[PDB]
Structure formats: structure tokens, C-alpha cells
Design a protein around this ligand. Sequence first.
Ligand code: BVF
Length: 168
Amino acid sequence: VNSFSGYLKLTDNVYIKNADIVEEAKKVKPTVVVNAANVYLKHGGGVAGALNKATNNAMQVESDDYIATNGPLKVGGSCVLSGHNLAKHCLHVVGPNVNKGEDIQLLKSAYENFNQHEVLLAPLLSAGIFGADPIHSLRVCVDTVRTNVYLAVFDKNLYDKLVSSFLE
Ligand SMILES: Cc1ccnc(N)c1
């Protein structure tokens, strides 16, 4: 139903909210929820771990089956799997892990995947354990994505930094 509420306009197609993406997915019933995945689709922490836990491991079992056919995703790549109880679809996107020296230029590639979907509930890509500056990631999102993005940021302090950087 894509019943988004309380999202702040950043650009005509990028909105942001201080919220837990799992709780958003349950309220919003989005067509697409984006996971911040790794190449092995192993949902062991951060957004991925949260989304998987909210599916009671339905997402991890489906992810294992895909990886059985595909082998690992490429950095900057994506796949579309079931959203289970969270969404119609989950778009698993692999941003670069800058801690492992993966090129930050692949962040644009990662966000380009969003352009295959009209409306998405998403996190910022390559933030947290992937080591990219989250405000940088928001700039790449805004520059790259032309479809409608509703970004969920869990931490209030980071949310206020992002909004201050973007609008002040
Ligand atoms: C634990 C956790 C980390 C990041 N985003 C969330 N929604 C939840």
C-alpha cells in the first residue's frame, strides 16, 4: 500500500525519516524494502540482521537458496527476493565495503539498482560496518536515484546531522 507518513522532503524524489526500517516496513506495507546486503546475502548484523530477524529467518533461508544458484553477488549488484511479511519484494543491494578497500565509486552502481523500482523504503548504503560516510552516501543517493526513495535512519544524532548537512 506504500502508506509512508512523517517523511521530510530532501529533494522531489528523496524523503527521510528518523525510524527503524523494520517498524516502517510493518506500518507502510511497501512494495519494495531495500536490504544493505553483503555479497553472500548473510544477514548477520545491522539492517540486514534486523530485517531477517523480523522475518524469523524466512529471508535467510530464501537468500541461501539464491546464493546456491548464483554464487555471491558482485559489489554494486543486487537481487530481488521476497519481502516476506515486510514488503512485497526485498531488493538486496551490495554497496562497497570501504574498510576492505572496495572502491567508493561502486556506491553509485549500488544506488543505480534503486532506479528499477518506482518506490522504495531504504537505508543509506555502505554506512555502518561498510565504512562510508553516511552523509556522502546520501549525496550519492540524491545524485543517482531518480525513482521515489523513502530513507529510514535509526539513530537520531545521525538523522539530525544528515538533515542539517542537506537543508542548512
Ligand atoms: C539494529 C539496526 C541497525 C540499523 N538499522 C536498523 N533499522 C536496525
